[PDB]
Design a protein around this ligand. Structure first.
Ligand SMILES: [Mg+2]
Ligand SMILES: [Mg+2]
Ligand SMILES: [Mg+2]
Ligand SMILES: [Mg+2]
Ligand SMILES: [Mg+2]
Ligand SMILES: [Mg+2]
Ligand SMILES: [Mg+2]
Ligand SMILES: [Mg+2]
Ligand SMILES: [Mg+2]
Ligand SMILES: [Mg+2]
Ligand SMILES: [Mg+2]
Ligand SMILES: [Mg+2]
Ligand SMILES: [Mg+2]
Ligand SMILES: [Mg+2]
Ligand SMILES: [Mg+2]
Ligand SMILES: [Mg+2]
Ligand SMILES: [Mg+2]
Ligand SMILES: [Mg+2]
Ligand SMILES: [Mg+2]
Ligand SMILES: [Mg+2]
Ligand SMILES: [Mg+2]
Ligand SMILES: [Mg+2]
Ligand SMILES: [Mg+2]
Ligand SMILES: [Mg+2]
Ligand SMILES: [Mg+2]
Ligand SMILES: [Mg+2]
Ligand SMILES: [Mg+2]
Ligand SMILES: [Mg+2]
Ligand SMILES: [Mg+2]
Ligand SMILES: [Mg+2]
Ligand SMILES: [Mg+2]
Ligand SMILES: [Mg+2]
Ligand SMILES: [Mg+2]
Ligand SMILES: [Mg+2]
Ligand SMILES: [Mg+2]
Ligand SMILES: [Mg+2]
Ligand SMILES: [Mg+2]
Ligand SMILES: [Mg+2]
Ligand SMILES: [Mg+2]
Ligand SMILES: [Mg+2]
Ligand SMILES: [Mg+2]
Ligand SMILES: [Mg+2]
Ligand SMILES: [Mg+2]
Ligand SMILES: [Mg+2]
Ligand SMILES: [Mg+2]
Ligand SMILES: [Mg+2]
Ligand SMILES: [Mg+2]
Ligand SMILES: [Mg+2]
Ligand SMILES: [Mg+2]
Ligand SMILES: [Mg+2]
Ligand SMILES: [Zn+2]
Lengths: 59, 157, 208, 105
RNA sequence: GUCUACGGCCAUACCACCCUGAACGCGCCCGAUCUCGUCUGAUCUCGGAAGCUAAGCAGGGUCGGGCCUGGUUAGUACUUGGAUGGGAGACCGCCUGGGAAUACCGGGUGCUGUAGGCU
RNA sequence: AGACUAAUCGAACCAUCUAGUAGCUGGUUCCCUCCGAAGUUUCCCUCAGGAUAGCUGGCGCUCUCGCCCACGCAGUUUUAUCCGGUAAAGCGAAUGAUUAGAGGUCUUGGGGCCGAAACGAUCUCAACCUAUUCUCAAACUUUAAAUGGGUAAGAAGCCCGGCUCGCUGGCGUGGAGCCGGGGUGGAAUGCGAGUGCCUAGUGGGCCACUUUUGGUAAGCAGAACUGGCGCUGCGGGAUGAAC
RNA sequence: CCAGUGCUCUGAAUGUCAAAGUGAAGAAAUUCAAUGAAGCGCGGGUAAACGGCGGGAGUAACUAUGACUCUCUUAAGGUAG
RNA sequence: GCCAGGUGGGGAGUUUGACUGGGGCGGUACACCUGUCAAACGGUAACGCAGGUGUCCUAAGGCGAGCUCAGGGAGGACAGAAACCUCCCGUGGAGCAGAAGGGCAAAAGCUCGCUUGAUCUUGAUUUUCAGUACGAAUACAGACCGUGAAAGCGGGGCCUCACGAUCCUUCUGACCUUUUGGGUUUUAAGCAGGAGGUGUCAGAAAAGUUACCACAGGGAUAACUGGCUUGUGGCGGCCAAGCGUUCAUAGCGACGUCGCUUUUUGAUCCUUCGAUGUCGGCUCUUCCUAUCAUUGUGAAGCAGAAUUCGCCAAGCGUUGGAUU
RNA sequence: GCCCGGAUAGCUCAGUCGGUAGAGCAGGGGAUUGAAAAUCCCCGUGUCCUUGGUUCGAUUCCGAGUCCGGGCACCA
């Protein structure tokens, strides 16, 4: 029952069939894993963009 | 069967080099890490809290998260079939800036200023890098003196 | 004690006698200099040594029988006390025997196939010294006829190059007498301490 | 190991550090008429023999010494548990050691 | 030209041995009632100036040792790619590019930022 | 004697349940056109099998090129910039093996003689120290290549201006976020890219240049990198799976 | 040779021991205790029951071999033949 | 008759791990660490090598502050190879619980002073990875704190291992949910987080023999041949210290080294498991030469005699028996 | 060739419990006997097999060998 154990012979040729797809470009990076106190500032900063300013900034 | 554990090939990689066993030089902490920066990862044997892992030594990633005294990076690590975007949490000592963008951002500043002057006097600039062309038809000098003759050496053991 | 034909080509990484191997017995050789060990520098000007040619191993016992036959011809033909022969190849490379017939097939196969140690051998590059013999200037045919009786006893094939240097000091024999007497070089037993002129000035005042 | 009788640790009723008594966890007597005891006994009564597998192959020698903590400070009295790592020997409240002392067997 | 307080690079700035050190300053020093600490005011703390650069420290020197930097060592040692190239093998030559390391030799021997003091 | 019990015995015969079960052997019926692999990961009472990824096929969908510069992508270089400790090298640099002499004299282990006879002293044999010296290391290194690994090469950028914040705070300060305005051109090279569903087969591998571990060695056993035989004929090697 | 494993004899002298039965508490389900048949545990018997049967050292006036002396040790240490 | 407790291979039903240079006996390479092998990123195998682990710690955890280590020298009542004090030098040559590797100097080490951050809870990520989990770890975040003058530092042990699912049980938590027609209470069922285990360690409940054997199969896997390899066996070659009255070599030859052979064996598993009938003898044939005798020669420590050493050489010969 | 056990006095055994060296036997000097055997008073001795790590300390706990004595070398 003796066998062969581990070989990456023909694994270079399988991986590059479809190709090493590099993710590299997308915009507005996902916002999980963020420092929460920072996020406990920024959601407040967004909700007073709407409410706090019409007349000051638009004019 | 390779004892698939953590930090196992690191007799030489987290080893501080030579004559620089000692404290971390405290400009290591006073570097300003804003978001979006491109920073490189070199492990340090001295700060045993937040060393990354052995498979991220030397890779180049991107800062996404900043805390009190560490920094989160997004890093393009490779696995079996494909290459992944991973999030590491590294303390500051195992970080340094990458001068690839610094010479790049100086490459931007020159190209902006040449663009300023191209509108100024009306001369076409060619700030875009062309590769190193084949040499020009230069004109050597051999004034009076003759070329030194070279023949090979004899063999003596 | 297996034939040395098999343990001849260098194949495995060096596996020396140290903290972790420990089981290999003593080398065949113990000593390395045979003639006038106490010799001055100026007594034996020329040197003749055996340039290795192959990239092979030498068995440790090949060293022993060679310095015997090399000693035996010098004491016959230049007499006693008229030469100095140094074996410049220390055997550290330890090899392994996987002892079997222990005669029956009812013990074990090739299962535990690591070797317990048997003896040491010595490695050889191309262009490497084996035995240097420094002699009186008159022994020039004898140094050839001494080592030719050793060349029939090492494995493989490697030649004899009567060198250009002064004895066993590394310096050129053409410049040695020109320069030892004048200044700088100071003789020291078999070797010669080379002095620089970058030392403290009481090094220079201690001479003259 | 040696862990002291008294220990000041966070209680979960009145939101503070309070002192506690480390008392030893015991298994306690199990119950007949519990859920799995009734189901195993309804399964058992019959000409079928042993149905659920009993375990014979023990390998571990150590139990995690786990700790009741009773709040000493009155009217709160919220018992809770904790764990120490695996260990062979455990005394609770005696013979803390000396450094500057000869053994003298 | 220098010096203190705080420092970044962390030996070109350490180490040994020696020569000089105006004025501030750094120091040593005289002292223990308070403050504070040890077997002891030596250390630590505490209050002052009778003395002195001998020490620290600062400068310079040593055919100095280290360190740093560049040559020689050497297009060598190894090396990606290539061959119906050699050789029984060992291993080697060639085309193609990349190319070190020590003996050994020569040269350096702190540079500074912020505030503040001396001529 | 495990014999005999209707040519049947270490449990007869007959019929049913029964077309019992099987990861195991053998077979699996018309042509043509297109596309075309795997023996690897992890876990399993897993090792002659599956599960899962990988690999394969099919069916679509969302777009762009048809006209002094495109968009996007990559088993490639180029230009920058960090990372490594293998070859080689070194041990008069650490650690660790290690050969041989000369100088120097505190140190006891031994003798030659002064001998009541005394560290009162003569030449020492050995060790010690200094400066040399031969040779080495998969589980040692100061040094340190070739090949290599990551990232970067702009409009997602860059600048100016202004508001928000419950976080930060001497500072209208730190930093994110939001709003409006202004200039497309930022190495070479090649290409049409992007994305979702379902799913067969596979899960016994083998040989060769160089690099390699166990062996004395093997048409042996185990690998790394790449190509191939397998899956593939043809021309050469008389003939042959791989040259 | 009664150590072992077996069979067997006898004892409330004495540790264990399940139902039923009784007592105490609980509104009751239930919870607890006391009492304790056979068997086990404890004591004896048996090997024409299974079967079991040692190793060192010193030692005699040629040297030798060892009656003898010693020691560890077992349930017992292979006697007749 | 019925219930309970003993005995019960007399009778019944099942189980007899896996990896393995065939199996078995052995060993754990079955989970997990460290150095290497690994061919300078990461990854990378063998019953490849060296080693460890299933623990220990109320301080060896935490914070502050003080101090600096092994080792050597010169000194000093009894004191010496070793007591104690003192001075000097002392870059890690000591120490940090134990395997090693890294890391460490007004410190991660030593001593001391207060201490329980080894506590409460929701995510995110790193590791192994299928990009699932346990385990472990890092950054945070909301609490309650410790220590410190303070900045800070700490949610265990300086880091890389030191541990464990469902179902069941047990315990704690809310002045919690459901207890089935509505209620009151006991019991039970749940939600959340701690334990009691699966070491074949991603988790079966488990002994043996078959020569009386049976079926499914395998040359994926032995024993016979044949092949590759030739250690071992067998045969030769080179060098010359010696031996040989003198004489290295007529005849031998130590120490060394280079080969051949497939009649021993060993090692390997490529061919054969829908079979290739596997010891020895007898009978008979051919061939090999590494020649025992014969034909012709060469050499001797060859006088003749007997011998021995080589050469062209397989033409011809190499018997009769007791024992197994 | 693998798997298991041990070294202590002149012999045979302890204690191996990491802080004493013990038990018997023989030898040695007494006394008892005219002389021995035996009895009584007495003592004498351990390179704790070798070597190193573990500890404050090794005779003990581990590792390493020098050897002695086991149990195994099974299916074709
Ligand atoms: Mg497989
Ligand atoms: Mg029943
Ligand atoms: Mg004073
Ligand atoms: Mg006082
Ligand atoms: Mg002064
Ligand atoms: Mg003076
Ligand atoms: Mg100077
Ligand atoms: Mg110098
Ligand atoms: Mg029978
Ligand atoms: Mg019949
Ligand atoms: Mg039958
Ligand atoms: Mg059918
Ligand atoms: Mg039917
Ligand atoms: Mg059927
Ligand atoms: Mg096709
Ligand atoms: Mg499998
Ligand atoms: Mg099949
Ligand atoms: Mg497709
Ligand atoms: Mg390496
Ligand atoms: Mg090398
Ligand atoms: Mg599949
Ligand atoms: Mg193979
Ligand atoms: Mg196939
Ligand atoms: Mg193909
Ligand atoms: Mg082909
Ligand atoms: Mg053809
Ligand atoms: Mg051919
Ligand atoms: Mg062919
Ligand atoms: Mg009995
Ligand atoms: Mg009753
Ligand atoms: Mg006798
Ligand atoms: Mg008898
Ligand atoms: Mg039965
Ligand atoms: Mg099996
Ligand atoms: Mg690597
Ligand atoms: Mg690599
Ligand atoms: Mg150390
Ligand atoms: Mg250590
Ligand atoms: Mg401290
Ligand atoms: Mg918090
Ligand atoms: Mg009801
Ligand atoms: Mg498992
Ligand atoms: Mg059976
Ligand atoms: Mg096959
Ligand atoms: Mg042979
Ligand atoms: Mg075979
Ligand atoms: Mg086969
Ligand atoms: Mg095979
Ligand atoms: Mg033993
Ligand atoms: Mg004895
Ligand atoms: Zn409370």
């Amino acid at each position: 029952a003796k066998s062969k154990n581990h070989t990456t012979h023909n694994q270079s040729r399988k991986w590059h069939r479809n190709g090493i797809k590099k993710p590299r470009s997308q915009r507005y990076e996902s916002l999980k894993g963020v420092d929460p106190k920072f996020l406990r500032n920024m959601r407040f900063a967004k909700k007073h963009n709407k409410k706090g300013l019409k007349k000051m900034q638009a004019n | 069967t390779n004892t698939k554990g953590k930090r196992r090939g690191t007799r030489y990689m987290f080893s501080r080099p030579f004559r620089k066993h000692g404290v971390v030089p405290l400009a290591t902490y006073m570097r300003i890490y804003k978001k979006g920066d491109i920073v490189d990862i070199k492990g340090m044997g001295t700060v045993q809290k937040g060393m990354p892992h052995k498979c991220y030594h030397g890779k180049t990633g991107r800062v996404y998260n900043v805390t009190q005294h560490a920094v989160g990076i997004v890093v393009n690590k490779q696995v079996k079939g494909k290459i992944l975007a991973k999030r590491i949490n590294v303390r500051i000592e195992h970080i340094k800036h990458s001068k690839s963008r610094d010479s790049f951002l100086k490459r931007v500043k020159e190209n902006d200023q040449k663009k300023k002057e191209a509108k100024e006097k009306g001369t076409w600039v060619q700030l875009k890098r062309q590769p190193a062309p084949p040499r020009e038809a230069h004109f050597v000098r051999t004034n009076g003196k003759e070329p030194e003759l070279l023949e090979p050496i004899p063999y003596e053991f | 004690r297996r034939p040395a034909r098999c343990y001849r080509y260098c194949k495995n990484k060096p596996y020396p006698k140290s903290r972790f191997c420990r089981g290999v017995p003593d080398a065949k050789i113990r000593i390395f200099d045979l003639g006038r060990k106490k010799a001055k520098v100026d007594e034996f000007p020329l040197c003749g040594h055996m340039v290795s040619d192959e990239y092979e191993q030498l068995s440790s016992e090949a060293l022993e029988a060679a310095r015997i036959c090399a000693n035996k011809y010098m004491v016959k033909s230049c007499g006693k006390d008229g030469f100095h022969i140094r074996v410049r190849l220390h055997p550290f490379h330890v090899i392994r025997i996987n002892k079997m017939l222990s005669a029956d097939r009812l013990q074990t196969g090739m299962r535990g196939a690591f070797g317990k140690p048997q003896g040491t051998v010595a490695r050889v590059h191309i262009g490497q010294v084996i035995m240097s013999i420094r002699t009186k200037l008159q022994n020039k045919e004898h140094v050839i006829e001494a080592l030719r009786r050793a060349k029939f006893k090492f494995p493989g094939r490697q030649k004899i190059h009567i060198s250009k240097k002064w004895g066993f000091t590394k310096f050129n024999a053409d410049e040695f007498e020109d320069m030892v007497a004048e200044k700088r070089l100071i003789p020291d037993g078999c070797g010669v301490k080379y002095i620089p002129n970058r030392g403290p000035l009481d090094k220079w005042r201690a001479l003259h | 190991v040696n862990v002291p009788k008294t220990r000041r640790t966070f209680c979960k009723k009145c939101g503070k550090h309070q002192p506690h008594k480390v008392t030893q966890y015991k298994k306690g007597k199990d119950s007949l008429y519990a859920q799995g005891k009734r189901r195993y006994d309804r399964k058992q009564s019959g000409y079928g023999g042993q149905t659920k597998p009993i375990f014979r192959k023990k390998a571990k020698t150590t139990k995690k010494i786990v700790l009741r903590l009773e709040c000493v400070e009155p009217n709160c009295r919220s018992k809770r548990m904790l764990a120490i790592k695996r260990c062979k020997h455990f005394e609770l409240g005696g013979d803390k050691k000396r450094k500057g002392q000869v053994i003298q067997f």
